[PDB]
Design a protein around this ligand. Structure first.
Ligand SMILES: O=C(O)c1cc2c(s1)-c1ccccc1CC2
Ligand SMILES: [Cl-]
Ligand SMILES: [Cl-]
Ligand SMILES: [Cl-]
Length: 258
């Protein structure tokens, strides 16, 4: 009757407890994934039955407020969330996706669809801040959870809601997609720090779709043409093959193979 749920709280969160959480998220996402090749491929959108389409992530904090994010298993991205008796959805791209989300949170009294989508370019505009200037960490995540809840009571304004999406998406969706970004978050939790992400994280996020295409279209592991990434100091380098990214990227959106 309900999609699978993973739980996480920032209250007393540790390196261990955040590691368990991301591992469970990856586990639910890859139930239907293709794991025969070097890197797991998320289920194909086309033909996926509706009862396999979503998973739910339920978050709480020291103030013991709770919100629940809905994640698409085909791309591990947040499509919307529930707070109290209300559900809120990013604007869908097409009719099929609009129909799919009517199967989420079917028991809330109030359903709203934002005019905007959930991509970073738009969310950065609404927040008034680039990812480069939005701190990540347990502290920021705790604050993001309260902000998401209080949107349903009129206590949160849309720019702060946008910045809270940016924090949640990166610390959950992107940390599940990339072992590399999980480690970046793990270091922040370990030393009790909050800091904005460096250029390597942002460029990895911006490249996930392109890397999924290059990997699944590769021939004997070799890319048909290079993809350019950044080190943490902003310097640039090229990747040419699948293998060097096996420790870096954990999940891929389905791509056709010629
Ligand atoms: O700051 C650094 O030293 C590095 C950052 C990255 C490196 S190295 C990398 C090396 C191979 C393959 C993918 C990556 C992703 C980001
Ligand atoms: Cl480890
Ligand atoms: Cl809806
Ligand atoms: Cl808009």
């Amino acid at each position: 009757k309900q999609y699978p749920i993973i739980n996480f709280t920032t209250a007393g969160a540790t390196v261990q407890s955040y590691t368990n959480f991301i591992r469970a998220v990856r586990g639910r996402l890859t139930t239907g994934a293709d794991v025969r090749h070097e890197i797991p491929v998320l289920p194909n959108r086309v033909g996926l039955p509706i009862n396999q389409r979503f998973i739910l992530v339920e978050l709480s904090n020291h103030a013991e407020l709770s919100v629940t994010l809905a994640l698409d298993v085909t791309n591990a991205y947040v499509v919307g969330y529930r707070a109290g008796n209300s559900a809120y959805f990013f604007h869908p791209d097409n009719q099929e996706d609009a129909e799919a989300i009517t199967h989420l949170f079917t028991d809330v009294q109030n359903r709203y669809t934002f005019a905007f989508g959930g991509n970073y370019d738009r969310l950065e505009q609404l927040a008034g801040n680039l990812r480069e200037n939005i701190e990540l960490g347990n502290g920021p995540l705790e604050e993001a959870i309260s902000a998401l809840y209080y949107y349903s009571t009129g206590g949160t304004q849309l720019p702060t809601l946008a910045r809270s999406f940016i924090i949640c998406i990166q610390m959950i969706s992107e940390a599940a997609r990339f072992q590399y970004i999980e480690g970046e978050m793990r270091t922040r939790i370990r030393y009790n720090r909050r800091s904005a992400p460096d250029p390597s994280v942002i460029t990895l996020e911006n490249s996930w779709g392109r890397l999924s295409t290059a990997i699944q279209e590769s021939n004997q592991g070799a890319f048909a043409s290079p993809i350019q990434l950044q080190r943490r100091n902003g310097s640039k380098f090229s990747v040419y093959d699948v293998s060097i990214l096996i420790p870096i990227i954990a999940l891929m959106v389905y791509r056709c193979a010629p």
